[PDB]
Symmetry: C3
Subunit: 111 residues, 3 copies
C-alpha cells in the first residue's frame, strides 16, 4: 500500500518552498498513516485559481489516497496534522479543504 497526497493552492511558493513543503507534508502523512516515507507520493500545485466560500483568499485543496488504512480516527488526526502545517505557513484553517479517498499500479504491475 502506498499513500498519495495531491495539493492545489492559490498561494505563490518559491521553488525552495515547494521542495520543503512536499518533504514536510510527506513526512506528516508517513507519521499519521504508519507508512515509511518510501511509499509516500506528494503533489503540490501552486498558483491555481481558487475560490472557496465565494472568496479567492489564500486556500488549499487536498486529497489523500491510500489503499486502506483510513478510518474515522486516522482521518481526524491526518486532518489536524496536515492543516497545522498550513496554519503554520500563513494559511487560515477555515480555508483548508481535505478529502480522503481510499486497484493501484507501480513499476508496470498491479497489486
Amino acid at each position: 500500500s502506498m499513500p498519495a497526497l495531491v495539493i492545489k493552492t492559490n498561494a505563490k511558493f518559491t521553488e525552495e518552498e515547494k521542495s520543503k513543503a512536499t518533504e514536510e507534508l510527506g513526512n506528516i502523512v508517513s507519521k499519521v498513516l504508519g507508512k515509511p516515507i518510501s511509499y509516500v507520493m506528494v503533489t503540490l500545485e501552486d498558483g491555481v485559481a481558487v475560490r472557496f466560500g465565494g472568496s479567492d483568499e489564500k486556500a488549499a485543496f487536498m486529497s489523500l489516497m491510500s489503499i486502506g488504512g483510513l478510518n474515522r480516527a486516522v482521518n481526524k488526526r491526518a486532518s489536524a496534522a496536515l492543516t497545522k502545517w498550513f496554519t503554520d505557513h500563513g494559511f487560515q484553517g477555515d480555508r483548508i479543504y481535505i478529502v480522503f479517498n481510499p486497484d493501484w499500479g507501480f513499476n508496470g504491475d498491479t497489486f
Copy 2:
C-alpha cells in the same frame, strides 16, 4: 456538507477571467446542488496540455466532489448547467468532460477536523 469542483483546461485565461470563471461556475454548482455559496470550493487550472478525441483543441476536464447530495438526477442537471457556461465562453460543448464523485463525512476534513 461541502462540494468541490476541480477544472482543468488548455485555454488561456487572464487573471480577471479566472476570477470570473470560479465565481460563475461556483454559483452554478451552488444552485444545482442546493447549497449556499459558502460551502462551495472551486479550482481552475488553465494552460494545461489537454488532448480529447485525438485533438488538442480547446477543451476542459471537470470533477465534482460533494459530501452526499449527489444523485442520478442532480448529476444530469449539473452536467448541463456547467457545460452551458463553457459554451457561452468560447468553448464547444463536445469538448467538456465531467466526473461526479460523492464521499462521506468521515472521509472529509475541514478546519483540522472531519465531519
Copy 3:
C-alpha cells in the same frame, strides 16, 4: 463509456513534447482498454512539485478513470509505464491510480449515463 487520464509530473516538457505525449499516451489507453480513441481524454501537467519516496527526482503521477479489470490493469500499468521509461523516467518513479466509476457518476455533453 469514456476513459480519462490525468498526469502530473515534475519534469519539464516543451509544448511540442506535451502534444506528442498526450497523443502517444492517449493512443496507449485506447488500445489497452478496447475503446475508440474518440472517447479518450488526456491531461498533462508538467512542472508540478513532486516528491515520491522522499526524493524529488523525476517522477509522474497518473489517474485513469473509466466507467466500469485484472487483465487491463496489468497491461495498462505496463504499457503506460513503458512510455515514461522510454522518455527519461524511472519505472519505480511512476505512480498509477485506477478509479472505476458508475454510469450515473459520469458526465459528457451535459448528460450522464
